[PDB]
Amino acid sequence: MQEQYRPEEIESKVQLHWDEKRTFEVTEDESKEKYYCLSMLPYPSGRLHMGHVRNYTIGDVIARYQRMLGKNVLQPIGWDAFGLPAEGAAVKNNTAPAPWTYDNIAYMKNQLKMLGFGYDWSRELATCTPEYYRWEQKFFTELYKKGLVYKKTSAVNWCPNDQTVLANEQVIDGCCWRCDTKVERKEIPQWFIKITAYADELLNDLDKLDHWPDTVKTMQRNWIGRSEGVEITFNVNDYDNTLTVYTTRPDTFMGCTYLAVAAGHPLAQKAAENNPELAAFIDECRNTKVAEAEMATMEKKGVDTGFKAVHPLTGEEIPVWAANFVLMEYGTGAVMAVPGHDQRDYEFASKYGLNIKPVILAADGSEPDLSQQALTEKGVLFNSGEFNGLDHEAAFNAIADKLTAMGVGERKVNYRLRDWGVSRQRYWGAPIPMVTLEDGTVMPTPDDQLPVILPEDVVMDGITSPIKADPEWAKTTVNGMPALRETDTFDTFMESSWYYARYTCPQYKEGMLDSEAANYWLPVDIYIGGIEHAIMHLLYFRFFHKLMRDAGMVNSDEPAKQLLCQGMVLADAFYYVGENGERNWVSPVDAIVERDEKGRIVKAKDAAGHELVYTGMSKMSKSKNNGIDPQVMVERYGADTVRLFMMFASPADMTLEWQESGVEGANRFLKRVWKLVYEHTAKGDVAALNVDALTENQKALRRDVHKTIAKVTDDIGRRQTFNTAIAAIMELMNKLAKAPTDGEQDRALMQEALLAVVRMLNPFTPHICFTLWQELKGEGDIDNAPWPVADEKAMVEDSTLVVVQVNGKVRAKITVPVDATEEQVRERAGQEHLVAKYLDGVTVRKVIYVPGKLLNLVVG
RNA sequence: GCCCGGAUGGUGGAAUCGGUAGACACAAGGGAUUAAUCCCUCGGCGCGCGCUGUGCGGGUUCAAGUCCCGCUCCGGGUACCA
Ligand SMILES: CC(C)C[C@H](N)C(=O)NS(=O)(=O)OC[C@H]1O[C@@H](n2cnc3c(N)ncnc32)[C@H](O)[C@@H]1O
Ligand SMILES: CCC[C@H](N)C(=O)N[C@@H]1[C@H](O)[C@@H](CO)O[C@H]1n1cnc2c(N)ncnc21
Ligand SMILES: [Mg+2]
Ligand SMILES: [Zn+2]
């Protein structure tokens, strides 16, 4: 062992030992107890950033911790290879998307190995290979035959000149980010999977997931949005077709003064032939972007349709209106509007001067005041004909039964959750196995023709997909006649919805899953990822597990037992507009900045000379070009230093703002650990520790060693608060530094401490601890060595601290024996001069005493 | 807009079940050997003391960073970024 700590010589040597001896490669061992520690697989963007490093350091800490407890730990790593960013970069760099992705996988694999995460590299998966996507294609065709797949029309962003589908990200400030023209909605047929079939199952099973956080669960409940209500049907005067509308407040039905409808309705098109102003409004709604954010934020405009719907109960003609806020997707694409008891409809009725009818009494039983706002609260009916006097429950059922009896109404469970649309029209994705014959009939691709392989060797113009551009690729022969297979590709969430299952048997050529291997590992014990995936991915993740369960592939009802949603690693984001209106995102390292007195950014230039637009802090990504590469810091300070800093800076779940300051404390700390072991082991071997032959200084030191083990085991195991665990070890290291190591009992005690401390740091800093474990002469490799257990006899306290307050404010602190009564604490508290100062000339009104913790004397 | 989080010294954070606010670190200042290491000071205002202090305004309690009511600002998601 050298005196100086040199990471460059140590770390690469230890990583080679793990690869050659195959330390973290594991099989389905029936003797050992299993632990599946899963981190979410990355998109191969190009470089890693500190967002990636935080995610995988957390998982490797848990995987190494659980390994030391004596369990067969599976920590897999793969690649979510398909995606949009591969296509844009391929055209820009003059390559195909396939080789761009494999080079990024090659680069990032090296970075992960250099960081030294104990992964099972034998179970590696690239989702862009046909070995992977063959089984989801096979699963999709099986899903179609069960009746869980269907085709329908859906709104899509469409740049009209180029004639290509754009994503939400590619639209910016109205116009399209490539060319100068406004983006429009286009109705296009697409494949959907019936996730709403499993709506109640996904919703109700959140109760069983007790080890998931309430942040994620409450978000999913509100996303699914189950809702029991009534679909009311209407007739129109000079129009044949009926208008059906959904509502959760049928009690307020007698106060319905008008009806609102979305722009893409048959009634709106019928009326727009004669009416020129309505025709102008419908063509304006093309510019409405496909996103809930910009749909709600815009001003709630509208125009009168002209047609008059007949209110079934009152018999009154009410005007139909067009509107922006009326979603085509949610409900029936049409609503009853009660402005008297809905804040959205009140604003609409106030603007355009529609009738505002009050039909619900206030809490007191008096008529409502609707001069300022609507009365959203539920109550007793008035101004409702026969339904007057009824409460909310009776009014709901009475108007439901009436409209059911009339035959223009029905009770229905409605979900906010829509069906999962999986058709994309880009190249770099798994092809959808569906075939349109010469007949005209559409049917699944047969089993002999699976997998429908995507051709990797291609050239891309940028506008159209090469598989779509070439008409020869689509050709095939099914049922003894020509046919055209689907050129649309899958959503990238499809590949990430079952990758966790495929890790159990990735080289299994027989089917989608080997059930012996799958049921051994599954369900997942801990699933670590971003809070960014709270809803979207995690809902598909769960949904897809239930489909595989119903297929008879897996036993468990839920895929993951525990979820650890780490906070986002944030960073500043800057950009300047290019020559042809293209957003060039500049990195914070390049950007020269002039700050405010408070800290906020005011101006923003770069090295060249562009006025950069500051878009606040945001998550690190290649999209906004604000990711910070760990390769510089790893080569400077070492992987262990980088890893330790990410865990020490903040607790896992909390959102971190990235900063370079703090890294030097981790490097200095590892030098202090190295120095203390160097000075200890240089003296030589040690004697056997006599437990009951120690001084009070030696007894107290050993108490702190075992108390740190109890804290660090709890902080990692239960709490996942790694910053408090690392801080607890830093305290113990400072006490061990000050402790003298002269005699036999001192060095015997120092052996026990250093063996414990090196084991507790092994999860965080595995490279340095592997080296130090051999120098302390421990049994075998540290990776397989057992986790330290605290001794209950060693941690016994003789006395306890007690704080002495006077009217809440602290005046004294005293040491008192553990087994001590309230009177004994009061007597000791009286002897203190700072306590007795505020007790003179005043009476003790009340005495509060927390056993062995606090005393608060309330004084007049 | 809607849903879910966050705000604590110059800085990242600790206080685990309402009970000592600032552990453990970084940055800064000064000292001590002669880049590296070890010491000292470190929320604010006026001392081996007193008041005050956890984004802003109220409230409950013997006691509030923690619980309650009303806001501000900052982040995540918002169905084609992954
Ligand atoms: C399952 C599948 C849908 C996952 C998908 N392939 C994916 O997300 N790929 S990835 O490359 O963007 O990320 C991989 C992991 O890293 C986390 N992460 C990313 N950015 C940050 C950040 N700024 N801060 C913290 N964590 C981040 C992210 O949540 C994920 O767990
Ligand atoms: C309180 C007065 C009645 C009120 N006016 C009402 O009918 N509300 C509908 C229902 O009560 C609620 C369910 O979430 O959303 C509304 N709703 C139903 N479909 C849609 C849609 N497509 N778009 C926007 N909101 C909708
Ligand atoms: Mg602050
Ligand atoms: Zn365009």
Side-chain angles (χ1 to χ4, degrees):
Chain A
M1 174 161 53
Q2 273 283 312
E3 188 181 355
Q4 193 184 122
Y5 172 52
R6 293 204 184 81
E8 70 279 9
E9 297 180 16
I10 297 162
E11 296 186 349
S12 57
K13 195 166 69 63
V14 174
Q15 289 160 17
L16 181 55
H17 176 83
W18 291 326
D19 295 324
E20 289 181 341
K21 298 301 196 81
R22 308 177 177 284
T23 310
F24 305 104
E25 298 190 355
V26 293
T27 66
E28 289 78 55
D29 188 24
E30 289 280 11
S31 64
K32 290 263 195 170
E33 190 177 44
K34 71 99 191 180
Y35 196 95
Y36 195 164
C37 178
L38 183 55
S39 304
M40 292 185 187
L41 85 179
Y43 174 84
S45 59
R47 304 296 104 86
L48 292 178
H49 51 72
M50 306 316 300
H52 288 107
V53 176
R54 204 192 186 184
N55 202 116
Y56 304 130
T57 309
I58 290 160
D60 197 54
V61 163
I62 295 156
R64 289 167 178 283
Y65 167 66
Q66 293 285 334
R67 178 175 258 279
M68 293 167 85
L69 297 174
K71 292 167 178 168
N72 195 41
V73 181
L74 175 60
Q75 197 182 8
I77 187 70
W79 307 100
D80 192 344
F82 285 129
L84 208 175
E87 297 191 346
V91 174
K92 200 174 197 299
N93 295 17
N94 195 44
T95 346
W100 186 86
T101 304
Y102 294 119
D103 290 19
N104 293 5
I105 289 158
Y107 195 103
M108 290 164 72
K109 181 162 174 183
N110 188 239
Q111 288 189 298
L112 291 164
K113 282 179 163 278
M114 283 179 70
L115 287 163
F117 302 126
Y119 287 130
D120 194 339
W121 288 108
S122 73
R123 304 166 178 272
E124 199 183 331
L125 286 171
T127 58
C128 58
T129 58
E131 279 71 40
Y132 188 79
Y133 66 72
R134 64 171 292 176
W135 305 116
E136 72 180 11
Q137 285 175 334
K138 188 74 177 70
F139 197 68
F140 189 81
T141 55
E142 289 168 25
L143 260 45
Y144 185 89
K145 290 177 276 188
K146 291 180 183 173
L148 297 171
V149 182
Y150 73 102
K151 201 168 195 174
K152 71 155 189 287
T153 315
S154 187
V156 167
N157 295 323
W158 181 269
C159 194
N161 293 43
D162 295 306
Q163 307 182 47
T164 309
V165 168
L166 302 175
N168 294 341
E169 189 171 39
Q170 295 178 307
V171 182
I172 40 166
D173 299 31
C175 300
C176 146
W177 78 331
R178 305 203 226 80
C179 83
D180 297 48
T181 192
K182 292 154 186 170
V183 182
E184 54 170 32
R185 298 173 81 83
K186 182 149 168 282
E187 300 299 330
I188 195 174
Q190 289 190 128
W191 295 105
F192 283 86
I193 298 162
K194 295 186 181 189
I195 196 165
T196 54
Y198 289 68
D200 292 338
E201 193 176 327
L202 288 163
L203 188 57
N204 294 327
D205 290 345
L206 292 170
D207 298 345
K208 295 199 276 70
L209 300 170
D210 64 319
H211 290 278
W212 281 39
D214 295 327
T215 50
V216 175
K217 295 190 289 193
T218 308
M219 272 191 281
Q220 286 194 9
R221 289 199 195 82
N222 298 349
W223 181 265
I224 293 162
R226 189 175 188 283
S227 155
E228 297 182 12
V230 178
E231 282 196 347
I232 307 169
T233 315
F234 286 79
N235 296 324
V236 183
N237 295 323
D238 300 353
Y239 187 62
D240 298 308
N241 300 16
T242 54
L243 297 172
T244 308
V245 301
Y246 181 75
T247 183
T248 53
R249 298 289 299 283
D251 61 311
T252 63
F253 181 47
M254 297 292 289
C256 177
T257 54
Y258 67 99
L259 304 181
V261 75
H265 213 270
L267 181 55
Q269 297 186 343
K270 179 66 173 185
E273 293 175 34
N274 300 130
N275 199 334
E277 194 184 340
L278 187 63
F281 183 75
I282 294 163
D283 290 304
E284 190 182 312
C285 299
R286 292 188 186 180
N287 297 127
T288 311
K289 201 182 80 178
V290 182
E292 197 176 43
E294 292 206 321
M295 277 259 51
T297 310
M298 65 166 62
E299 194 180 47
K300 294 152 186 170
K301 298 184 178 180
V303 185
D304 183 35
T305 307
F307 291 111
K308 297 272 173 291
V310 182
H311 196 299
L313 300 175
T314 58
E316 190 179 8
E317 297 186 347
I318 50 169
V320 182
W321 274 69
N324 301 357
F325 68 87
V326 174
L327 299 169
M328 191 96 275
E329 297 170 316
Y330 191 104
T332 61
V335 290
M336 80 180 205
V338 181
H341 312 297
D342 193 62
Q343 201 66 47
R344 192 174 61 194
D345 296 322
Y346 187 86
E347 291 161 19
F348 193 82
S350 298
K351 187 179 171 183
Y352 293 95
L354 297 165
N355 189 24
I356 298 164
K357 189 169 166 184
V359 296
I360 306 288
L361 296 167
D364 72 329
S366 189
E367 296 186 347
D369 178 40
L370 309 183
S371 63
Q372 312 305 325
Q373 59 181 343
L375 182 61
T376 194
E377 290 94 319
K378 299 165 178 180
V380 177
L381 292 172
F382 82 108
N383 204 342
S384 298
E386 73 190 315
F387 302 104
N388 288 21
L390 297 167
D391 71 317
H392 175 68
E393 293 290 308
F396 190 98
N397 298 324
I399 295 163
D401 293 325
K402 188 81 168 189
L403 296 165
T404 304
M406 289 169 61
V408 290
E410 52 169 19
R411 299 165 191 280
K412 187 176 278 282
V413 179
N414 194 290
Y415 306 98
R416 184 193 136 73
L417 178 55
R418 316 193 298 261
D419 294 313
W420 179 17
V422 295
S423 296
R424 298 287 176 283
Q425 33 278 125
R426 322 202 209 85
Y427 160 73
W428 194 233
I432 301 165
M434 288 287 156
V435 175
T436 310
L437 304 177
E438 189 174 294
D439 290 316
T441 54
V442 179
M443 54 168 287
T445 311
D447 296 12
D448 69 313
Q449 295 180 40
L450 297 171
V452 175
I453 299 161
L454 192 76
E456 299 198 323
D457 184 40
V458 293
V459 285
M460 303 207 312
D461 61 337
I463 297 162
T464 316
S465 175
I467 58 160
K468 297 178 184 286
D470 179 40
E472 296 295 333
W473 187 89
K475 290 177 165 183
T476 185
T477 162
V478 186
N479 301 358
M481 54 162 60
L484 295 167
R485 67 207 175 185
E486 184 69 64
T487 59
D488 287 6
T489 49
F490 280 122
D491 185 22
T492 55
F493 283 101
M494 190 76 79
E495 292 95 55
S496 68
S497 294
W498 65 285
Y499 78 105
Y500 76 97
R502 189 56 175 179
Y503 281 139
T504 62
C505 50
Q507 306 298 298
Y508 188 60
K509 301 290 188 175
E510 318 309 322
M512 186 162 186
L513 295 170
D514 178 32
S515 295
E516 268 57 45
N519 293 314
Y520 173 80
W521 289 115
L522 299 169
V524 177
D525 295 278
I526 184 74
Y527 191 47
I528 304 156
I531 198 72
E532 61 172 35
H533 300 299
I535 294 166
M536 281 270 82
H537 158 55
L538 281 170
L539 203 69
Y540 302 141
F541 171 64
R542 290 173 63 205
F543 169 60
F544 211 99
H545 186 82
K546 293 160 189 307
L547 295 171
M548 293 184 293
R549 186 204 63 199
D550 292 17
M553 306 175 179
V554 292
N555 297 144
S556 55
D557 293 321
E558 290 292 321
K561 294 199 183 194
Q562 198 178 331
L563 189 78
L564 179 56
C565 278
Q566 55 147 22
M568 299 287 95
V569 176
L570 301 171
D572 292 313
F574 305 91
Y575 77 96
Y576 65 96
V577 178
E579 298 197 63
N580 203 57
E582 189 170 298
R583 287 188 162 185
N584 299 332
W585 295 85
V586 188
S587 188
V589 176
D590 299 357
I592 300 162
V593 180
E594 189 183 339
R595 287 185 179 282
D596 189 16
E597 290 189 328
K598 281 78 171 186
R600 297 168 62 186
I601 298 176
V602 181
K603 285 186 177 178
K605 297 181 181 293
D606 63 321
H610 305 110
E611 188 164 30
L612 305 179
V613 184
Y614 179 50
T615 63
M617 287 270 185
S618 67
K619 67 182 185 170
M620 288 188 183
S621 54
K622 190 60 172 177
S623 303
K624 299 185 176 181
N625 202 54
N626 64 330
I628 304 301
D629 202 320
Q631 192 66 16
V632 175
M633 290 167 56
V634 170
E635 291 170 11
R636 191 91 288 173
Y637 302 111
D640 289 355
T641 310
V642 171
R643 291 158 67 108
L644 187 68
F645 174 53
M646 295 296 297
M647 303 302 87
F648 183 72
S650 183
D653 63 316
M654 196 175 194
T655 313
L656 180 62
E657 294 192 320
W658 175 241
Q659 55 174 230
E660 194 64 25
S661 305
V663 297
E664 208 83 327
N667 195 235
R668 281 198 284 267
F669 174 63
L670 294 173
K671 287 178 177 179
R672 286 199 297 283
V673 171
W674 187 267
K675 181 175 169 183
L676 189 60
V677 174
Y678 178 77
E679 293 175 338
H680 171 76
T681 55
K683 294 160 183 167
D685 296 313
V686 295
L689 184 62
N690 195 295
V691 177
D692 53 357
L694 301 168
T695 56
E696 294 297 332
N697 291 304
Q698 293 170 17
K699 192 203 171 188
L701 178 53
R702 193 160 181 279
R703 199 206 306 101
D704 297 7
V705 170
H706 289 291
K707 280 175 74 174
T708 304
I709 292 162
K711 181 167 170 59
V712 170
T713 305
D714 186 44
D715 289 16
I716 294 169
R718 190 173 63 78
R719 303 171 66 192
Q720 293 82 48
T721 54
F722 304 126
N723 63 318
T724 57
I726 294 156
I729 301 160
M730 286 179 178
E731 284 171 273
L732 185 60
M733 279 297 308
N734 296 344
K735 293 180 178 168
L736 292 159
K738 295 181 178 181
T741 60
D742 301 352
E744 291 201 325
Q745 291 283 77
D746 296 314
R747 293 192 64 253
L749 180 52
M750 186 55 68
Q751 183 66 16
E752 189 180 43
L754 292 167
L755 288 166
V757 171
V758 169
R759 284 181 289 169
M760 287 183 291
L761 262 43
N762 182 50
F764 306 107
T765 59
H767 303 98
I768 194 177
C769 296
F770 187 87
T771 310
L772 295 163
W773 186 250
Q774 294 177 223
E775 298 295 307
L776 297 166
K777 303 196 174 187
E779 294 175 295
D781 295 22
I782 196 169
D783 297 307
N784 299 304
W787 185 259
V789 182
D791 199 338
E792 291 285 2
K793 293 170 183 172
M795 299 185 292
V796 177
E797 302 292 348
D798 51 63
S799 55
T800 181
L801 190 139
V802 180
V803 181
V804 185
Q805 294 177 339
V806 177
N807 307 336
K809 298 176 185 174
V810 180
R811 304 301 182 183
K813 304 180 190 174
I814 50 165
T815 304
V816 184
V818 174
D819 54 346
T821 57
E822 189 178 331
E823 277 63 41
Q824 291 167 303
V825 173
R826 281 200 71 180
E827 203 277 302
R828 184 70 186 78
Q831 294 172 27
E832 296 294 334
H833 76 277
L834 296 169
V835 176
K837 186 177 174 186
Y838 297 99
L839 293 171
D840 271 42
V842 283
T843 315
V844 178
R845 297 183 184 177
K846 198 191 292 184
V847 180
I848 310 301
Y849 176 61
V850 185
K853 233 74 177 177
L854 178 67
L855 184 78
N856 183 33
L857 303 171
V858 183
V859 178

